[PDB]
Coordinates of C-alpha atoms in Angstrom, one line a residue:
Chain A
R1 CA 79.2 27.0 235.0
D2 CA 77.6 27.9 233.1
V3 CA 78.2 25.2 230.0
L4 CA 76.4 26.1 226.8
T5 CA 75.9 23.9 224.2
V6 CA 75.0 25.0 220.6
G7 CA 74.5 22.5 216.7
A8 CA 74.8 24.3 213.9
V9 CA 74.8 22.7 210.7
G10 CA 78.3 22.1 209.2
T11 CA 77.9 24.9 205.9
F12 CA 77.3 27.4 208.4
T13 CA 80.2 26.7 211.0
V14 CA 82.3 26.4 208.9
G15 CA 81.7 29.4 205.4
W16 CA 80.5 32.0 208.4
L17 CA 80.1 31.0 212.7
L18 CA 83.7 29.8 213.2
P19 CA 84.7 33.5 211.9
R20 CA 82.8 35.6 214.1
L21 CA 82.7 33.4 217.5
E22 CA 86.3 34.9 218.9
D23 CA 84.3 38.3 219.1
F24 CA 81.6 35.3 221.2
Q25 CA 84.1 34.2 223.7
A26 CA 85.6 37.9 224.0
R27 CA 82.8 39.0 225.0
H28 CA 81.4 36.0 227.1
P29 CA 84.8 34.8 228.8
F30 CA 82.5 32.9 231.3
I31 CA 80.3 30.7 229.5
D32 CA 81.9 27.5 228.5
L33 CA 80.8 26.7 224.8
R34 CA 80.4 23.5 223.3
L35 CA 79.7 23.4 219.4
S36 CA 78.8 20.5 217.1
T37 CA 78.4 20.7 214.0
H38 CA 75.9 18.8 211.7
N39 CA 73.9 17.8 208.2
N40 CA 70.9 19.7 208.8
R41 CA 68.6 16.2 210.2
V42 CA 69.9 16.9 213.8
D43 CA 68.3 15.7 216.3
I44 CA 68.4 18.1 219.1
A45 CA 67.6 15.9 221.9
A46 CA 69.5 13.2 221.1
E47 CA 73.0 15.0 220.6
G48 CA 71.7 17.0 224.0
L49 CA 71.8 20.7 222.4
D50 CA 70.6 23.5 224.2
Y51 CA 70.3 25.4 220.2
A52 CA 70.4 23.8 216.9
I53 CA 71.6 26.2 214.1
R54 CA 69.6 24.6 210.4
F55 CA 68.6 25.3 207.2
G56 CA 65.0 25.5 205.7
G57 CA 61.4 27.2 206.3
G58 CA 61.7 27.6 210.1
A59 CA 59.1 25.6 210.9
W60 CA 60.2 22.5 212.8
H61 CA 57.7 20.0 214.9
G62 CA 58.4 20.5 218.8
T63 CA 60.5 23.8 217.6
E64 CA 60.5 27.3 218.3
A65 CA 63.0 28.3 215.9
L66 CA 64.3 32.3 215.0
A67 CA 65.4 33.8 211.6
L68 CA 68.7 34.6 211.4
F69 CA 69.1 35.5 207.5
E70 CA 68.4 34.6 204.2
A71 CA 70.6 31.4 201.8
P72 CA 70.1 32.3 198.6
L73 CA 71.3 29.6 197.0
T74 CA 73.2 30.4 193.2
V75 CA 75.6 28.2 190.7
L76 CA 79.1 27.9 191.9
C77 CA 81.7 26.0 189.3
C78 CA 85.4 25.3 189.1
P79 CA 87.0 28.4 186.4
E80 CA 87.4 24.8 184.3
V81 CA 83.8 24.9 183.9
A82 CA 82.7 28.3 184.0
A83 CA 85.1 28.8 181.1
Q84 CA 82.1 27.0 179.2
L85 CA 79.1 27.9 180.2
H86 CA 77.5 31.0 178.1
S87 CA 74.3 30.4 179.2
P88 CA 72.2 29.0 181.7
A89 CA 71.1 26.7 179.2
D90 CA 74.6 25.5 178.6
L91 CA 74.3 23.4 182.3
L92 CA 72.9 20.5 181.1
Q93 CA 75.5 19.2 179.3
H94 CA 77.4 19.0 182.9
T95 CA 76.6 16.7 186.3
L96 CA 74.1 18.6 187.8
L97 CA 75.2 18.3 192.0
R98 CA 72.4 18.4 194.4
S99 CA 71.0 18.5 198.0
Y100 CA 68.6 16.1 199.0
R101 CA 66.5 19.4 199.2
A102 CA 64.9 18.0 195.2
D103 CA 63.5 21.5 194.1
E104 CA 66.3 23.6 193.9
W105 CA 67.6 23.1 190.4
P106 CA 64.2 23.4 189.1
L107 CA 63.1 26.5 191.2
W108 CA 66.5 28.2 189.7
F109 CA 65.8 27.1 186.2
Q110 CA 62.7 29.1 186.9
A111 CA 64.4 32.0 188.4
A112 CA 66.8 31.7 185.4
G113 CA 63.4 32.3 182.9
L114 CA 64.2 28.1 181.9
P115 CA 61.4 25.3 182.1
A116 CA 62.0 23.5 185.4
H117 CA 64.1 20.8 184.6
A118 CA 64.0 18.2 187.0
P119 CA 67.8 16.7 186.9
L120 CA 67.7 13.1 187.4
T121 CA 71.0 11.4 185.8
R122 CA 73.3 12.5 185.3
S123 CA 73.7 13.8 188.9
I124 CA 74.8 13.3 192.9
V125 CA 73.0 13.5 196.0
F126 CA 75.2 15.8 198.9
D127 CA 74.4 15.4 202.4
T128 CA 76.0 18.8 202.6
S129 CA 77.3 21.9 201.0
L130 CA 80.5 21.5 201.7
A131 CA 80.7 18.4 200.5
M132 CA 79.0 19.3 197.2
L133 CA 81.6 22.5 196.5
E134 CA 84.6 19.7 197.0
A135 CA 83.0 17.9 194.3
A136 CA 82.2 21.0 192.0
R137 CA 86.5 22.5 192.9
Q138 CA 87.1 18.8 192.0
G139 CA 85.5 19.3 188.6
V140 CA 82.7 16.9 188.6
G141 CA 80.3 19.3 188.4
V142 CA 77.9 22.2 188.6
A143 CA 77.2 23.3 192.2
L144 CA 73.6 24.5 193.8
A145 CA 74.7 26.2 196.8
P146 CA 74.2 29.2 199.1
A147 CA 77.0 31.8 197.6
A148 CA 77.4 33.6 201.3
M149 CA 78.3 30.7 202.6
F150 CA 81.5 30.2 200.0
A151 CA 82.6 33.9 200.3
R152 CA 86.4 32.7 201.6
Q153 CA 86.5 30.8 198.2
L154 CA 85.0 33.1 196.1
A155 CA 87.2 35.9 197.5
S156 CA 90.2 33.7 196.9
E157 CA 89.1 32.8 193.2
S158 CA 89.2 29.3 194.2
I159 CA 85.9 29.0 192.6
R160 CA 83.6 30.8 190.7
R161 CA 80.0 32.3 190.3
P162 CA 79.2 32.0 186.3
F163 CA 75.5 33.7 186.8
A164 CA 73.7 36.7 188.2
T165 CA 70.4 34.8 189.2
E166 CA 69.8 33.6 192.4
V167 CA 66.3 31.9 193.8
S168 CA 65.2 32.0 197.9
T169 CA 64.6 28.8 199.6
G170 CA 65.3 29.0 203.0
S171 CA 67.5 30.7 205.7
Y172 CA 69.6 29.5 208.5
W173 CA 68.0 29.4 212.0
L174 CA 68.8 29.4 215.4
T175 CA 66.1 26.9 217.0
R176 CA 65.2 25.1 220.3
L177 CA 62.6 22.6 221.7
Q178 CA 60.2 24.1 222.9
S179 CA 60.5 21.7 225.9
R180 CA 63.3 23.2 227.4
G181 CA 63.1 26.8 228.7
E182 CA 66.0 29.2 227.9
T183 CA 69.3 29.5 230.2
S184 CA 71.4 32.7 230.9
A185 CA 74.2 31.4 228.3
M186 CA 71.4 30.7 225.9
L187 CA 70.3 34.1 226.5
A188 CA 73.2 35.7 226.2
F189 CA 73.9 33.3 223.0
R190 CA 71.3 34.7 221.4
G191 CA 71.6 38.3 221.4
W192 CA 75.5 37.5 220.1
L193 CA 74.4 35.7 217.4
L194 CA 71.3 37.9 216.4
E195 CA 73.4 41.5 216.7
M196 CA 76.0 39.1 214.7
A197 CA 72.8 38.2 212.1
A198 CA 71.6 41.5 211.3
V199 CA 75.0 42.6 210.3
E200 CA 74.7 40.0 207.7
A201 CA 71.5 40.2 206.4
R202 CA 72.1 44.2 206.7
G203 CA 75.3 43.4 204.4
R204 CA 73.1 41.9 201.3
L205 CA 71.0 44.8 201.0
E206 CA 74.1 46.8 201.2
Chain B
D1 CA 69.7 -0.3 185.4
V2 CA 69.7 1.8 188.3
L3 CA 72.1 1.1 191.5
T4 CA 72.1 3.5 194.6
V5 CA 75.1 3.5 196.6
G6 CA 75.1 5.7 199.6
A7 CA 79.3 6.8 201.1
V8 CA 80.4 8.6 203.5
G9 CA 80.8 12.1 202.3
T10 CA 84.5 12.7 203.5
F11 CA 84.6 9.0 201.5
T12 CA 82.9 10.2 198.4
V13 CA 84.8 13.5 197.6
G14 CA 88.3 12.8 198.5
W15 CA 88.7 9.1 197.2
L16 CA 86.0 7.8 195.2
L17 CA 84.4 10.6 192.9
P18 CA 88.5 11.0 191.1
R19 CA 87.9 7.4 189.7
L20 CA 84.5 7.1 189.1
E21 CA 85.1 8.2 185.6
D22 CA 86.8 4.8 185.3
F23 CA 83.7 3.2 186.0
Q24 CA 81.2 4.7 184.3
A25 CA 83.4 4.2 180.6
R26 CA 83.9 0.5 181.6
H27 CA 80.2 -0.3 182.4
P28 CA 79.0 3.0 180.4
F29 CA 74.8 1.8 180.5
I30 CA 74.7 1.9 184.2
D31 CA 72.6 4.1 186.0
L32 CA 74.3 4.9 189.4
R33 CA 72.3 7.0 191.9
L34 CA 75.2 8.1 194.4
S35 CA 74.1 9.9 197.5
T36 CA 76.3 11.0 200.3
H37 CA 76.2 11.0 204.3
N38 CA 77.8 11.2 207.7
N39 CA 78.3 7.6 208.4
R40 CA 75.5 7.0 210.4
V41 CA 72.6 5.6 208.1
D42 CA 70.2 3.0 208.3
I43 CA 70.8 1.1 205.0
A44 CA 67.0 -0.4 204.7
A45 CA 65.4 3.2 205.3
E46 CA 67.7 5.4 202.9
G47 CA 66.8 2.2 200.3
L48 CA 70.6 2.1 199.4
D49 CA 71.3 -1.3 197.1
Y50 CA 75.4 -0.6 199.0
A51 CA 76.5 1.9 201.8
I52 CA 80.1 2.8 202.0
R53 CA 80.7 3.3 206.2
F54 CA 84.1 4.1 208.0
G55 CA 84.3 1.2 211.1
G56 CA 84.8 -2.0 212.2
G57 CA 83.0 -3.6 210.1
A58 CA 80.2 -5.4 212.2
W59 CA 77.3 -3.8 211.6
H60 CA 74.4 -6.1 212.3
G61 CA 72.6 -7.5 209.4
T62 CA 75.1 -6.4 206.9
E63 CA 77.3 -8.1 204.7
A64 CA 80.3 -5.5 205.1
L65 CA 83.2 -6.4 202.5
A66 CA 86.8 -4.5 204.1
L67 CA 88.2 -2.0 200.7
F68 CA 91.3 -0.2 203.0
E69 CA 92.3 0.7 206.3
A70 CA 92.1 5.1 206.9
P71 CA 94.7 5.7 210.4
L72 CA 94.4 8.8 211.5
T73 CA 97.0 12.0 211.8
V74 CA 97.5 14.9 213.1
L75 CA 97.0 17.9 210.0
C76 CA 96.8 21.7 210.4
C77 CA 97.6 24.8 208.6
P78 CA 101.0 26.2 207.6
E79 CA 101.6 28.5 210.7
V80 CA 100.7 26.4 213.8
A81 CA 102.6 23.5 212.2
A82 CA 105.8 25.9 212.4
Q83 CA 104.7 25.8 216.1
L84 CA 104.8 22.0 216.8
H85 CA 108.0 21.0 217.2
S86 CA 107.1 18.0 219.4
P87 CA 103.5 15.9 220.1
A88 CA 103.2 17.4 223.8
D89 CA 103.1 21.0 221.8
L90 CA 99.5 20.1 220.5
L91 CA 97.9 20.8 223.7
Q92 CA 98.7 24.5 223.3
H93 CA 95.7 24.5 220.5
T94 CA 92.2 23.3 220.2
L95 CA 91.8 19.8 219.9
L96 CA 89.0 19.0 216.8
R97 CA 87.6 15.8 217.1
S98 CA 84.9 14.0 215.4
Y99 CA 81.9 12.2 217.1
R100 CA 84.2 9.1 218.0
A101 CA 84.2 8.4 220.7
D102 CA 87.7 8.5 220.8
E103 CA 90.5 9.0 218.8
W104 CA 92.4 11.5 220.4
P105 CA 93.8 9.8 223.5
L106 CA 94.8 6.4 221.5
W107 CA 96.8 9.3 219.1
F108 CA 98.3 9.9 222.0
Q109 CA 99.1 6.7 223.2
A110 CA 100.7 5.9 220.0
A111 CA 102.6 9.0 219.8
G112 CA 104.0 7.7 223.2
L113 CA 102.7 10.0 225.6
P114 CA 100.0 9.4 228.5
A115 CA 96.7 11.0 229.2
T116 CA 91.3 22.3 225.4
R117 CA 87.4 22.6 224.8
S118 CA 86.8 22.0 221.8
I119 CA 84.7 21.1 218.6
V120 CA 83.2 18.2 217.4
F121 CA 82.7 17.4 213.9
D122 CA 79.9 15.1 212.0
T123 CA 82.7 15.0 209.0
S124 CA 86.3 15.4 208.9
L125 CA 85.4 17.8 205.4
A126 CA 83.7 20.4 207.8
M127 CA 86.7 19.5 210.3
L128 CA 89.8 20.2 208.0
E129 CA 88.1 23.4 206.5
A130 CA 88.5 24.9 209.9
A131 CA 91.8 23.6 210.5
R132 CA 92.7 25.4 206.9
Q133 CA 91.3 28.5 208.3
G134 CA 93.7 28.8 211.9
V135 CA 90.4 26.8 214.4
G136 CA 92.6 24.5 215.2
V137 CA 94.5 21.3 215.1
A138 CA 92.9 18.3 213.4
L139 CA 93.2 14.5 213.3
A140 CA 91.8 12.6 210.7
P141 CA 93.0 10.2 207.7
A142 CA 95.7 11.9 205.6
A143 CA 94.6 9.8 202.2
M144 CA 91.2 11.7 202.0
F145 CA 92.9 14.6 202.3
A146 CA 95.3 14.1 199.4
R147 CA 94.1 17.5 197.2
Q148 CA 95.1 19.6 200.3
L149 CA 98.4 18.2 201.4
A150 CA 99.9 18.2 197.6
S151 CA 99.4 22.0 197.6
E152 CA 100.9 22.1 201.1
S153 CA 97.7 24.2 202.0
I154 CA 97.9 21.7 204.8
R155 CA 100.6 20.5 207.0
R156 CA 101.2 16.9 208.6
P157 CA 103.2 17.9 211.1
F158 CA 104.1 14.1 212.6
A159 CA 104.9 10.8 211.3
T160 CA 102.7 8.9 213.9
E161 CA 99.4 7.3 212.7
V162 CA 96.9 5.4 214.3
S163 CA 94.5 2.9 212.7
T164 CA 90.9 2.8 214.3
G165 CA 88.7 1.3 211.6
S166 CA 88.5 0.7 207.6
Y167 CA 86.3 2.0 205.2
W168 CA 83.4 -0.3 203.9
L169 CA 81.1 -1.9 201.4
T170 CA 78.4 -3.1 203.4
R171 CA 74.5 -4.6 202.2
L172 CA 71.6 -6.2 204.4
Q173 CA 71.5 -9.6 203.9
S174 CA 68.4 -9.5 203.0
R175 CA 68.0 -8.2 199.9
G176 CA 69.6 -9.4 196.5
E177 CA 72.8 -8.7 194.7
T178 CA 71.8 -7.0 191.5
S179 CA 74.2 -7.1 188.4
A180 CA 74.7 -4.0 188.6
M181 CA 75.5 -4.2 192.2
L182 CA 78.2 -7.5 191.2
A183 CA 79.8 -5.0 188.5
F184 CA 80.0 -2.3 191.2
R185 CA 81.7 -4.7 193.8
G186 CA 84.0 -6.2 191.5
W187 CA 85.5 -2.4 190.1
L188 CA 85.9 -1.2 193.6
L189 CA 87.8 -4.0 194.9
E190 CA 90.0 -4.0 192.3
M191 CA 90.8 0.4 192.8
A192 CA 91.2 -0.8 196.6
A193 CA 93.0 -2.9 196.0
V194 CA 95.7 -1.1 194.3
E195 CA 95.3 1.6 197.2
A196 CA 96.3 -0.4 200.4
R197 CA 99.1 -1.9 198.2
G198 CA 100.3 1.7 196.7
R199 CA 100.3 2.4 200.7
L200 CA 103.1 -0.5 201.1
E201 CA 104.9 0.6 198.2

């Protein structure tokens, strides 16, 4: 009375949602929110979610998806490794940490004005950017991830952005099953989340 | 000469990656394809030689070799740790939970306590980052967060721990042990014995 269950990708939950969720609970004291995290293969029905927030193109079968904001990808690494990089061409001297989406590194090299390499060895594939950024922190390799999800780390200087080049491969989306009606707590949560998302998208042009 | 290992992500980053340089120095012509997952995997569907998982070692169709035990303890940021004097003080904070099913009861039990509304985490990695941010109090294997404890950005308020599972090297009984596999198996078991030894020591 009333129950609301939301699942979000872990990187989005700890990098973005949780810093703002105190605002939601103040403005909606009566909604009992059940937040869980997942790794972007979330199955709404199996986990009992009303909404799932995930990353990609917004065209998931059986799903209605509302765009929140873009998450452009950039190179992120430890200061150790950052000092050793002068041009993006130096990157092939390092382990390239990557996600299961295999075209992010060639897409980014393109955006940097380099051929569309194509990194199979040496490289390690990560289910979550959190695991990828922790590996990058520990000097294992060079990460390619959304800067806007690791703002704290960057502002604390605990990790570094060595280049300006970005590439836009996906957005964060609020998704829901077409099969299910939107409850009143769902509508309340959606309104608050869209407001917060608009401030974020607005901030990146600002 | 390829070898595909899929390891749960907390284990990969908190323990296996800092030691992999050794392996790559001792077998420089193995092409390891390391991937991570969230402990809920289908070895066949993902096409792995080995998976490394947390749990009880009894997954149907798979040969599971134990590595070491992973006892869970309470972990939080410095300020909330100061507010924590005894275990009963914990219910004053939000309990950060994993999708298991469930470990807080057993930990309470182990700390001599009897029988709020909170957050479930697919990975201890996400859980530990919320604990650093002050969102709540985590229950997770301290052995996987040596880095955060050494710098004291994360604190362990209580000595109580509770064993609920181990890390395991698993393989479908079906497909054959490759030579690259055998070499990884030997090296990993040696590295794991040092770790278990160290806990007693």
